[PDB]
């Protein structure tokens, strides 16, 4: 519980309904319940999990940045700090929830390179979101946990996936942003985004029209970042 009494198939069906209704907190709760059933998530189901929590934490992160900026300008009593801390704590709780699903037991049960890479990329992302708000005796350990998860995902993806695979591309995109704005390694960020882009372009000739659209969509995002950074 609270989703333990609902059939796995019903949870997946409701997650898809919640997405259509733009009810992403509901969507995430249904996907948490589906994960906790203990069976594989398909490609489609992994996408549902990722999209649900992306939207939940995305709203929290946007709110945190607004409040953090107001707080910085104020430095009115304790209210701005208090409310920023409230949002921050709720954000950290969502990150901890996702990382707990990954560690218990999505990753160890991922018997595919493509499933394992998907989950390790998520682990990197949610440690990175923790790093965005960290300012404590563990910001350094959080940053190292993100890098480690991303690096392992990169190692597997380069061995087992073509350079145009959209999960591989989205992983490199996010690891590059990690380097630029979390790790203070803008040269690493630029190197990764550039090699990833070029190696995808060189592989496009192997793809169908549909796969080509998939890959070029993420290539556009790599290009946008390089255009910002160089």
């Amino acid at each position: 519980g609270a989703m333990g009494s609902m059939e796995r198939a019903s949870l997946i069906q409701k997650a898809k309904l919640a997405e259509q209704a733009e009810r992403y907190e509901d969507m995430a709760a249904f996907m948490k319940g589906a994960v906790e059933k203990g069976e594989e998530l398909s490609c489609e189901e992994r996408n549902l999990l990722s999209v649900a929590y992306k939207n939940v934490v995305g709203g929290q992160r946007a709110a945190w940045r607004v409040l953090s900026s107001i707080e910085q300008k104020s430095n009115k009593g304790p209210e701005v700090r208090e409310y920023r801390e409230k949002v921050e704590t709720e954000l950290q709780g969502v990150c901890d929830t996702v990382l707990g699903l990954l560690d218990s037991h999505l990753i160890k049960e991922a018997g595919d390179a493509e499933s394992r890479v998907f989950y390790l990329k998520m682990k990197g992302d949610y440690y990175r979101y923790l790093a965005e708000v960290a300012t404590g005796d563990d910001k350094k350990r959080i940053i190292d946990s993100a890098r480690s998860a991303y690096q392992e995902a990169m190692d597997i993806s380069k061995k087992e996936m073509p350079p145009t695979n959209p999960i591989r591309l989205g992983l490199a995109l996010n690891f590059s942003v990690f380097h630029y704005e979390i790790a203070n390694s803008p040269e690493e960020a630029i190197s990764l985004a550039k090699t990833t882009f070029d190696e995808a372009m060189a592989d496009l000739h192997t793809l169908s029209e549909d796969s080509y659209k998939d890959s070029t969509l993420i290539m556009q995002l790599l290009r946008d970042n390089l255009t910002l950074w160089t």
Binding site: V177, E181, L221, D224, N225, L228, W229
Partner: peptide, 5 residues
């Protein structure tokens, strides 16, 4: 513009 992820 904000970087993309």
């Amino acid at each position: 513009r904000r970087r993309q992820t």
